[PDB]
Amino acid sequence: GTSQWLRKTVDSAAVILFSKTTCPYCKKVKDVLAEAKIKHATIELDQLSNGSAIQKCLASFSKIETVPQMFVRGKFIGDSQTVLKYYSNDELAGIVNESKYDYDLIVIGGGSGGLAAGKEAAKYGAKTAVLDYVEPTPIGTTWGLGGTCVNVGCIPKKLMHQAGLLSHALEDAEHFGWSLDRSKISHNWSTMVEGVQSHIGSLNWGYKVALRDNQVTYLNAKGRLISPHEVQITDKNQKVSTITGNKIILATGERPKYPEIPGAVEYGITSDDLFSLPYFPGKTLVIGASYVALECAGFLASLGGDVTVMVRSILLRGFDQQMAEKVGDYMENHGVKFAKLCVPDEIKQLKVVDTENNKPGLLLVKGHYTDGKKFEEEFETVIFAVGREPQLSKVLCETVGVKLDKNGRVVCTDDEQTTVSNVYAIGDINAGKPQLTPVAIQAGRYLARRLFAGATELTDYSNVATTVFTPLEYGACGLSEEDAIEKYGDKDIEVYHSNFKPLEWTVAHREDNVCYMKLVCRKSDNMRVLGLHVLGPNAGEITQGYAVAIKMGATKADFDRTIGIHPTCSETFTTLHVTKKSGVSPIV
Amino acid sequence: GTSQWLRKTVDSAAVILFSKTTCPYCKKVKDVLAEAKIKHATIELDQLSNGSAIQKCLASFSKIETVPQMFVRGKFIGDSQTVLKYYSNDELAGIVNESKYDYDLIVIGGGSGGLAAGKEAAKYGAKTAVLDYVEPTPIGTTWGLGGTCVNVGCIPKKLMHQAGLLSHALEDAEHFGWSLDRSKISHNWSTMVEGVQSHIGSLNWGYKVALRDNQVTYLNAKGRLISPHEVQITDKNQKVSTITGNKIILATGERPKYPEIPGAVEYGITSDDLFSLPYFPGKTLVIGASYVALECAGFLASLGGDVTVMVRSILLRGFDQQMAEKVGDYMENHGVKFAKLCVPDEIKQLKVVDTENNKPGLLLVKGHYTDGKKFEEEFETVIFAVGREPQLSKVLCETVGVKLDKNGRVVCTDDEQTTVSNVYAIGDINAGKPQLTPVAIQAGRYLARRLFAGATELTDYSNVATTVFTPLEYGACGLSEEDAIEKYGDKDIEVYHSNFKPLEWTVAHREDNVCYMKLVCRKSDNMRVLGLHVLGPNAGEITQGYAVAIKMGATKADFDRTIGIHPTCSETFTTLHVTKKSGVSPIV
Ligand SMILES: Cc1cc2nc3c(=O)[nH]c(=O)nc-3n(C[C@H](O)[C@H](O)[C@H](O)COP(=O)(O)OP(=O)(O)OC[C@H]3O[C@@H](n4cnc5c(N)ncnc54)[C@H](O)[C@@H]3O)c2cc1C
Ligand SMILES: Cc1cc2nc3c(=O)[nH]c(=O)nc-3n(C[C@H](O)[C@H](O)[C@H](O)COP(=O)(O)OP(=O)(O)OC[C@H]3O[C@@H](n4cnc5c(N)ncnc54)[C@H](O)[C@@H]3O)c2cc1C
Ligand SMILES: CC(=O)N1CCC(NC2CC2)CC1
Ligand SMILES: CC(=O)N1CCC(NC2CC2)CC1
Ligand SMILES: CC(=O)N1CCC(NC2CC2)CC1
Ligand SMILES: CC(=O)N1CCC(NC2CC2)CC1
């Protein structure tokens, strides 16, 4: 079945040239298309295994078997002589631009996955439009091009994390001989926000420049898919029009949820608001226990804030719960307060936010615990981090026929196709996929190569590593301990673990046995590493490289025969030997 | 095959029990040995592929074929009934202690490898002595148990590096909103030295406690091997004596070299003296260009010093030379001066060191460039970092028969055996091996297991990752680019590379295109990764995990299908695409 690959490739591509590396008649067609500023995909057949059979099947469209052969939007155009005839007759530009729709591709959503898909497709001659719009938050916050990660997620989160880490660096520097006095140093919230927002502005602008230089049309517009090939767009002044595209990629992401309780929307905020907030939050309550809740609470305390987290049930639901508890214990020991097994009932306003003097307001939070006892306390800022959800009713007409699941996410095949054959979805709205920025980028780039350059590589969504940037960071790749035990049984699981202490913490007089790591392994499969977990500084840097080994099937013997780099935190993975079944302590 | 292994295992093990997991009489013997504090190896025949063959071969030694069987130093002792008889009759202790020699093992040298070998051997019942001595430096410097890395190597070097890193952390903190003024903060050298030396002292003590708790005899003595089984030991008071051992492990390491020029030994120092120097070096000249030279020049400059490095020919000979040059370019941009193609001719004393007032002296350094021009300049401190060498003529009487190579290192088989069948060598003095602390530890532990516990695993010295802790760190694993081209030819080698900027450097306004990473791959072996190189922060944490993947045979495709962790520096390895042959720019 090489024939049905070739048919799908020729059908879907915009401009594609079948070529060979040594053929100089091919080279003359290349240099002609380059000078004409015509972009295209190229399939070198001497570099593919079965390029012989493909050459034969090209005759089914073109009635010739030689190379080069040029196609445009499913139609054969000519061999060398015919393409040069079109060029010197000035007929070539009209032929490549002839299309049944306005665009080969329309991307709805200009974030991590959408921008990456659109730029990749434009590399192969696909005429591309990228639509993006930011619906404002209840208090009116808005931002520029690039999506959740760039503006209100990974980028400003980690910069603010770094600002918190530097407070411990100032304390540490005294013990290492520097003459500063940490107790006499304080933090300016608005200076930090100005620097963070200035970096984000350079990224908004770089993405506009990127799209321009790839000949991608950027429309700042709210998109709505009304039929398989029609997208209705609405302007900043409410002007409405319609554009048409061959392929459609949905990549509109999610926004934060609010609890259905009085006062929440009126008087609370979310992470959408926190990263450009013009005043220090002050005494803050963070409601929820996701990674967003814990990351935000953690740097606020490190910047000297008075911080409480209200937890309905457990921390980091879905992550390894031994690890989650070590994360929260570290936080509790370094100034974050927890109200456990608790839930909010209402937010009362006591003092309006003072815009002129750059001051928070004042709120009264009422709630109750699972036993029945009551919660009541005042806070200057209340931040909700109780999940995120898509809003596809605003994007999709029911009549088009794109199937959603019961959470509102799009049901896709393993190549991102929806139930409507020309419509695909990527990123956080793809049901069941990990909701991470590098996943959405890989999904979008690989999809664009399949649609417009005849690629076959799929995205692999298994064993994707994560890092939670709490004050002590937590990296992971693979199964939690409890998920492995439940899948294979407790007698088939072996766990190797150890505490450790970074060398940097010795002269600084930090704790001896808080950093921690383990390997969860399958006995009956040669001690296969099923999950890796580490709590310590620089956990993202530590974890990333092991994700390649786990993808490759690493076993415990693979970790053992590798030698460590000394002195590092990471090298402790190369000499693990204490098992949980042995009952031997893991302390250093 | 099996029979030669069994003969080897029985002959050299001190106390060993042959057993099966489900064998109630074996359990009877284990309990008696545990109750009598008799340490021993154990081989569970049911856990071995060919335990059936082994069980039959045991009769060639004991004339029985059941388990348990207990041996001591090559002699069958009995089954369960016979062992209990010796126990009940108060005869067991003297049986398990009977030996032709004072010790089952004598380790000459108490550093990284030797301490690890000694402790591991004692775990299996081997009666063990560890000998350690520290020959003072020319000005009298000395230190405690633990070797080069612990006292005058990796540990104090990386602590001082960390002190240097904190100066940039103090600068960065302003930009992230903290109120300090970096320009009014200074560094106190003796305060840092006191904290470093306190940590080292806790490690000196920890090793003495560990050897005690493992029943290893520690002798603070200079050792000399005068025949295959006799070690002469000389006292702190010059008392001489002789001990005997069955097996000998040489683990005496190396010391710094001095160039043969007037004034070098009298008025200069080495790294052996630097890590406990009671005064700040002041204006300093580092002579040499190894990683020791550049790491020391590096943190001295970050701590406010006026620093010059005098380079005979190139930086970091034997490392990838493109990366070496980026390392040195970064140092030159951040204050380190270089005198290139230059060599020293003599050191003259202008001032004597002032021990009382705690101040360096003053020196005049004279030398010449390779074209004949003259070098002449004054310095307060001159550090020689021009290599290290063993001193085995002090350890190894000629008549013993242990063969050395032309550099004076010990020629060993792949199981660390020397030319004398009961004598082994590990660590820096094993010719041709990487000279690193984790390698010496792996070699010593693995060897002890083969000698006293029947193990067969050998140490793997290939593709061992390294990290150079210059102000911008350089991590690596596998071949340099020039080595790969030399070995396979330029047309079979593809290099993927990219610049990157750490997110933490954005708000701090640090350099855009200084950090750098590349993968060196072999086209004809499925784009196998031959070498990985990265220059940036936390380079050792970044690199370690990739070393497991390389050990496993990772290819470029394995790096592409792995998803990144965002935002990290390390994730840049998972999306590399610009090749050096393309000529496309690697900047961002
Ligand atoms: C606080 C926080 C921290 C995070 N930290 C990390 C982290 O450290 N690492 C990590 O890997 N991930 C992190 N994430 C997750 C990451 O941000 C997302 O997985 C990623 O942004 C998803 O990208 P996307 O392309 O699917 O959608 P998005 O990046 O959300 O972009 C979709 C865009 O489409 C727009 N849009 C919506 N509807 C329409 C419409 N009708 N018309 C036009 N445009 C529309 C949206 O306004 C938005 O601009 C974090 C998320 C949050 C909230
Ligand atoms: C400045 C510096 C920095 C380094 N940094 C790193 C780093 O970051 N990472 C890394 O992996 N490696 C590093 N190394 C290398 C590391 O220190 C060595 O590879 C390691 O210490 C060698 O271990 P060893 O057991 O072979 O010998 P050693 O650790 O040198 O121990 C040998 C011991 O035997 C003693 N001895 C000698 N002769 C006798 C005798 N006749 N009788 C009794 N005792 C004797 C010696 O005095 C010494 O105590 C560094 C080295 C230096 C010099
Ligand atoms: C609704 C509609 O007609 N559009 C909305 C997006 C706008 N983009 C401006 C031209 C750069 C204009 C087009
Ligand atoms: C609620 C609200 O103010 N918005 C809806 C209409 C939007 N028009 C998009 C920007 C082209 C602007 C945002
Ligand atoms: C006989 C000799 O010269 N030795 C010197 C070193 C001594 N150390 C142990 C604690 C006494 C051991 C004896
Ligand atoms: C065996 C031992 O501990 N010694 C102490 C110091 C050694 N060298 C100093 C320079 C004279 C000599 C012997």
Side-chain angles (χ1 to χ4, degrees):
Chain A
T2 290
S3 99
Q4 60 243 54
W5 167 82
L6 184 69
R7 185 170 179 111
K8 216 158 92 63
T9 294
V10 164
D11 226 301
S12 198
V15 193
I16 184 161
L17 173 96
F18 297 85
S19 174
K20 277 172 155 181
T21 59
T22 39
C23 146
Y25 279 81
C26 312
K27 177 115 208 91
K28 190 162 279 149
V29 185
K30 284 169 191 188
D31 300 329
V32 149
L33 293 177
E35 158 168 288
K37 312 263 200 221
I38 297 208
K39 306 180 283 169
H40 59 89
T42 304
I43 301 263
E44 309 283 0
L45 295 137
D46 62 301
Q47 296 181 173
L48 268 165
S49 97
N50 71 321
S52 266
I54 293 167
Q55 284 203 252
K56 301 263 228 152
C57 316
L58 281 165
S60 326
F61 298 90
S62 68
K63 274 101 209 142
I64 45 171
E65 303 176 277
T66 55
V67 86
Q69 313 194 15
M70 214 197 84
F71 298 67
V72 164
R73 292 181 187 90
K75 180 188 127 121
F76 170 65
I77 289 312
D79 62 354
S80 33
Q81 205 181 308
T82 292
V83 167
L84 288 76
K85 188 268 173 170
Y86 284 142
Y87 191 20
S88 46
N89 219 88
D90 79 34
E91 302 170 298
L92 189 42
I95 275 173
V96 300
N97 288 338
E98 142 177 83
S99 152
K100 176 159 66 181
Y101 311 99
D102 293 314
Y103 299 99
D104 290 304
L105 172 67
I106 291 168
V107 186
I108 314 190
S112 298
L115 288 163
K119 275 180 262 141
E120 184 74 7
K123 299 198 183 344
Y124 309 105
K127 189 180 169 55
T128 310
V130 169
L131 289 41
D132 194 49
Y133 172 47
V134 179
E135 177 92 33
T137 71
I139 65 163
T141 310
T142 191
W143 52 83
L145 180 65
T148 291
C149 182
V150 156
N151 297 278
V152 286
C154 344
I155 296 299
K157 177 268 298 279
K158 201 185 184 209
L159 283 170
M160 265 184 217
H161 176 56
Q162 171 73 355
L165 294 165
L166 283 163
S167 88
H168 305 73
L170 309 175
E171 336 185 303
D172 286 352
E174 313 197 15
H175 298 283
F176 280 92
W178 294 92
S179 67
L180 83 165
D181 181 12
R182 163 72 183 103
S183 53
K184 302 195 176 1
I185 297 154
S186 65
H187 190 255
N188 185 313
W189 170 267
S190 60
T191 300
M192 166 181 88
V193 168
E194 282 288 305
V196 165
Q197 286 302 322
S198 191
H199 178 58
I200 294 172
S202 82
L203 300 172
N204 300 327
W205 169 249
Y207 281 123
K208 285 150 145 187
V209 169
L211 290 189
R212 178 201 81 202
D213 292 357
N214 278 273
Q215 298 79 47
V216 169
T217 294
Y218 165 54
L219 303 172
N220 180 27
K222 179 171 182 168
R224 170 172 210 112
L225 185 82
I226 65 184
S227 86
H229 296 279
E230 308 198 276
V231 176
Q232 177 204 270
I233 52 179
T234 308
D235 163 279
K236 67 194 334 173
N237 330 299
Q238 305 285 29
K239 163 159 55 44
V240 179
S241 81
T242 292
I243 52 161
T244 65
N246 193 20
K247 311 296 184 198
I248 307 288
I249 287 172
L250 310 163
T252 54
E254 306 189 324
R255 299 292 292 267
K257 300 187 200 177
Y258 286 79
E260 254 190 307
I261 70 175
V265 174
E266 294 84 354
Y267 309 129
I269 59 165
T270 68
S271 53
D272 278 0
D273 302 299
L274 175 66
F275 300 115
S276 62
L277 204 61
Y279 49 86
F280 184 53
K283 176 170 193 225
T284 301
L285 174 64
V286 170
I287 291 177
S290 59
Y291 75 87
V292 175
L294 299 193
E295 287 175 348
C296 287
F299 69 73
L300 286 175
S302 281
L303 301 170
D306 180 346
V307 174
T308 306
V309 184
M310 172 183 306
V311 181
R312 165 163 325 241
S313 48
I314 68 191
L315 307 179
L316 299 176
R317 181 169 290 274
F319 291 92
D320 183 290
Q321 282 295 291
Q322 176 198 26
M323 289 327 272
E325 178 178 29
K326 289 178 182 304
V327 175
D329 290 347
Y330 185 88
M331 272 157 101
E332 193 170 59
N333 279 329
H334 289 267
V336 177
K337 293 157 265 184
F338 289 81
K340 333 201 79 196
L341 312 172
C342 195
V343 152
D345 289 316
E346 46 176 339
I347 318 303
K348 316 267 90 180
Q349 178 176 58
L350 302 175
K351 211 175 288 205
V352 166
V353 174
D354 185 4
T355 278
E356 160 164 7
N357 298 297
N358 232 54
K359 282 309 297 263
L362 176 59
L363 309 166
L364 178 78
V365 180
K366 289 180 73 90
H368 68 280
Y369 298 86
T370 36
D371 49 11
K373 185 86 228 63
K374 296 299 157 224
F375 182 96
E376 178 154 336
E377 189 171 2
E378 292 181 351
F379 298 94
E380 295 177 279
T381 291
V382 172
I383 300 169
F384 292 98
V386 292
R388 306 163 60 75
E389 68 191 342
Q391 332 180 291
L392 285 183
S393 76
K394 311 181 181 188
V395 182
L396 265 172
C397 271
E398 46 289 322
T399 65
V400 184
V402 173
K403 201 99 180 201
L404 308 186
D405 70 6
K406 85 216 165 43
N407 299 135
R409 301 193 177 89
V410 189
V411 177
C412 294
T413 68
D414 71 343
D415 67 332
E416 289 73 61
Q417 206 183 27
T418 73
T419 50
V420 184
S421 69
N422 65 298
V423 178
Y424 303 72
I426 60 179
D428 289 356
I429 68 182
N430 189 323
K433 297 322 187 291
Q435 305 187 295
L436 305 159
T437 267
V439 177
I441 289 170
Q442 180 104 333
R445 286 183 185 146
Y446 279 27
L447 171 55
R449 284 171 201 164
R450 293 198 306 274
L451 296 163
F452 300 114
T456 55
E457 204 81 82
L458 302 182
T459 299
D460 183 351
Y461 296 94
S462 68
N463 286 309
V464 175
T466 57
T467 296
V468 178
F469 297 98
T470 36
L472 200 51
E473 296 169 13
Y474 164 40
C477 180
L479 294 183
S480 60
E481 194 169 322
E482 55 265 49
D483 282 16
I485 292 167
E486 143 176 290
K487 188 161 161 85
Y488 295 110
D490 176 81
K491 289 200 333 310
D492 201 21
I493 299 299
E494 191 87 288
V495 179
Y496 300 90
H497 68 149
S498 182
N499 290 113
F500 63 97
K501 179 174 206 175
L503 182 56
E504 292 73 24
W505 288 16
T506 60
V507 167
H509 295 295
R510 298 197 172 279
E511 308 101 293
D512 289 340
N513 292 294
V514 299
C515 302
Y516 180 82
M517 61 167 67
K518 61 175 180 191
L519 294 173
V520 179
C521 300
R522 195 185 169 191
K523 293 199 216 166
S524 68
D525 185 21
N526 295 125
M527 224 39 96
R528 194 80 52 187
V529 178
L530 299 176
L532 177 152
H533 301 263
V534 54
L535 169 69
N538 305 307
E541 312 296 358
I542 286 169
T543 300
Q544 174 74 91
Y546 295 107
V548 187
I550 291 162
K551 177 64 53 190
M552 290 175 71
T555 65
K556 173 61 149 66
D558 291 322
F559 278 67
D560 287 346
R561 76 202 170 103
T562 303
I563 306 305
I565 310 176
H566 182 71
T568 66
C569 299
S570 190
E571 67 177 313
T572 299
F573 274 113
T574 70
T575 63
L576 288 173
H577 64 100
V578 174
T579 70
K580 289 196 168 175
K581 284 246 183 61
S582 81
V584 177
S585 179
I587 74 184
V588 198
Chain B
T2 290
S3 325
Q4 314 155 271
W5 168 85
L6 184 62
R7 165 78 172 289
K8 245 167 93 202
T9 296
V10 170
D11 265 26
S12 82
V15 185
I16 188 165
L17 179 73
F18 287 93
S19 177
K20 312 191 141 181
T21 83
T22 60
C23 160
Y25 275 106
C26 307
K27 233 302 172 179
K28 233 152 198 164
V29 171
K30 280 134 117 150
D31 291 351
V32 154
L33 302 175
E35 175 173 275
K37 313 315 225 324
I38 288 160
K39 282 173 289 146
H40 62 88
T42 306
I43 301 207
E44 308 280 6
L45 301 175
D46 45 321
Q47 311 301 67
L48 285 170
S49 141
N50 64 335
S52 266
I54 281 162
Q55 195 150 3
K56 225 150 171 63
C57 276
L58 277 172
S60 321
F61 296 95
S62 58
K63 307 185 163 336
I64 51 164
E65 333 193 349
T66 50
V67 293
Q69 311 192 25
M70 190 179 150
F71 296 69
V72 172
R73 289 170 195 100
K75 179 195 193 183
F76 173 63
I77 291 315
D79 58 6
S80 42
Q81 161 153 16
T82 299
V83 169
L84 301 195
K85 188 271 166 156
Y86 291 138
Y87 196 31
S88 299
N89 275 78
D90 221 286
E91 312 174 280
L92 193 47
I95 280 179
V96 303
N97 284 340
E98 149 167 271
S99 172
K100 211 189 128 53
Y101 302 112
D102 298 316
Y103 299 95
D104 292 299
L105 167 65
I106 295 170
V107 183
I108 305 182
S112 290
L115 287 175
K119 280 180 278 124
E120 184 76 12
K123 272 156 220 153
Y124 304 106
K127 211 254 208 293
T128 307
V130 168
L131 280 37
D132 200 55
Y133 173 51
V134 185
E135 185 67 34
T137 75
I139 66 179
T141 312
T142 187
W143 51 83
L145 183 63
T148 289
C149 179
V150 162
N151 299 281
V152 288
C154 346
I155 301 297
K157 162 283 285 291
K158 209 195 180 198
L159 286 168
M160 276 187 207
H161 176 57
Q162 172 71 358
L165 295 173
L166 283 167
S167 71
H168 303 69
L170 298 179
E171 321 200 275
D172 290 356
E174 304 196 31
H175 296 285
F176 282 89
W178 292 94
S179 70
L180 86 166
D181 182 11
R182 162 75 184 88
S183 280
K184 329 230 157 267
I185 299 156
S186 64
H187 187 256
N188 180 319
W189 167 270
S190 70
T191 302
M192 159 186 96
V193 166
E194 286 290 320
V196 169
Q197 289 296 322
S198 209
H199 179 60
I200 292 165
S202 90
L203 300 169
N204 299 149
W205 177 247
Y207 284 123
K208 302 210 218 70
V209 166
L211 290 186
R212 187 199 71 202
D213 291 355
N214 273 256
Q215 298 70 51
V216 172
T217 297
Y218 168 51
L219 305 174
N220 185 26
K222 171 183 234 194
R224 208 181 134 74
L225 188 72
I226 59 173
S227 74
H229 296 281
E230 313 170 276
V231 179
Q232 177 190 271
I233 54 182
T234 305
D235 186 310
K236 173 259 210 66
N237 319 125
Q238 307 304 118
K239 148 181 199 232
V240 176
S241 88
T242 293
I243 57 176
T244 68
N246 189 13
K247 313 284 181 206
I248 320 293
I249 292 172
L250 314 172
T252 48
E254 299 190 320
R255 294 295 288 273
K257 275 151 123 162
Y258 286 82
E260 280 187 302
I261 61 174
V265 175
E266 301 91 341
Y267 311 123
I269 64 175
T270 72
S271 68
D272 280 356
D273 309 292
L274 178 63
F275 299 118
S276 63
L277 213 60
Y279 49 87
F280 182 61
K283 186 191 188 192
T284 301
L285 172 71
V286 179
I287 295 164
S290 59
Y291 74 93
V292 168
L294 296 182
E295 291 175 334
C296 290
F299 68 72
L300 285 175
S302 290
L303 300 172
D306 180 343
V307 184
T308 309
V309 182
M310 180 183 289
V311 182
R312 183 176 292 256
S313 58
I314 58 187
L315 310 174
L316 296 175
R317 181 175 290 280
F319 295 84
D320 182 291
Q321 280 297 292
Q322 177 197 25
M323 306 300 294
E325 175 171 41
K326 294 177 173 297
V327 166
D329 281 353
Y330 182 88
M331 287 170 78
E332 194 174 48
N333 278 325
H334 297 254
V336 177
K337 284 160 281 171
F338 288 81
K340 304 186 257 260
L341 310 167
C342 192
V343 146
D345 297 311
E346 67 182 315
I347 322 299
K348 298 146 140 217
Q349 184 176 58
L350 301 188
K351 281 160 147 137
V352 173
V353 168
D354 191 349
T355 298
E356 193 147 323
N357 291 48
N358 217 55
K359 296 198 65 233
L362 186 64
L363 312 170
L364 178 66
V365 176
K366 311 261 289 323
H368 65 278
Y369 300 89
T370 56
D371 61 1
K373 298 195 162 71
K374 285 325 181 117
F375 182 93
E376 185 171 309
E377 203 181 343
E378 295 185 354
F379 301 89
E380 300 180 272
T381 295
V382 167
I383 307 170
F384 290 103
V386 298
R388 301 165 63 75
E389 81 197 336
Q391 295 271 339
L392 281 172
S393 85
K394 297 184 217 173
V395 187
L396 216 48
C397 193
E398 283 269 85
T399 54
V400 180
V402 171
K403 173 192 219 185
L404 311 181
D405 74 7
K406 63 159 192 94
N407 311 317
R409 287 179 190 94
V410 185
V411 180
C412 295
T413 70
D414 75 354
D415 76 338
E416 286 75 61
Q417 209 190 34
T418 74
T419 47
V420 179
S421 61
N422 67 303
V423 178
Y424 300 74
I426 60 177
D428 287 349
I429 62 180
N430 186 317
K433 306 306 190 288
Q435 308 194 305
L436 305 155
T437 278
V439 169
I441 295 176
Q442 180 103 329
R445 286 186 189 150
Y446 278 35
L447 175 62
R449 294 179 190 167
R450 300 195 302 271
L451 291 170
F452 298 116
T456 62
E457 196 82 52
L458 302 184
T459 296
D460 184 349
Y461 298 95
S462 73
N463 287 308
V464 171
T466 60
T467 293
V468 177
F469 293 99
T470 35
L472 201 52
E473 297 169 13
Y474 167 43
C477 177
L479 301 171
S480 62
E481 177 169 344
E482 56 266 52
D483 279 7
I485 293 170
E486 142 83 353
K487 177 183 184 84
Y488 294 116
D490 173 85
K491 279 184 333 280
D492 200 25
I493 294 293
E494 190 91 290
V495 180
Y496 303 89
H497 63 163
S498 182
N499 289 124
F500 62 98
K501 178 170 206 187
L503 179 60
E504 295 72 29
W505 284 18
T506 56
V507 170
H509 300 291
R510 304 209 163 263
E511 308 99 299
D512 288 339
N513 287 289
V514 160
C515 306
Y516 182 78
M517 76 165 56
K518 74 192 183 179
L519 298 173
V520 176
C521 299
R522 185 191 177 181
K523 294 193 199 178
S524 58
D525 190 21
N526 289 166
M527 218 49 98
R528 191 89 50 198
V529 174
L530 300 172
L532 176 147
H533 307 260
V534 53
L535 168 73
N538 312 303
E541 308 303 349
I542 291 181
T543 298
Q544 172 75 93
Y546 292 109
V548 187
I550 290 169
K551 178 61 66 199
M552 295 176 59
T555 66
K556 181 52 157 69
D558 292 313
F559 278 69
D560 294 344
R561 74 204 170 100
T562 307
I563 312 296
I565 308 177
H566 179 75
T568 61
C569 300
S570 183
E571 74 175 309
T572 299
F573 271 113
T574 78
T575 60
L576 288 184
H577 65 100
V578 173
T579 66
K580 273 185 194 187
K581 281 328 190 44
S582 74
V584 175
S585 179
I587 52 62
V588 192

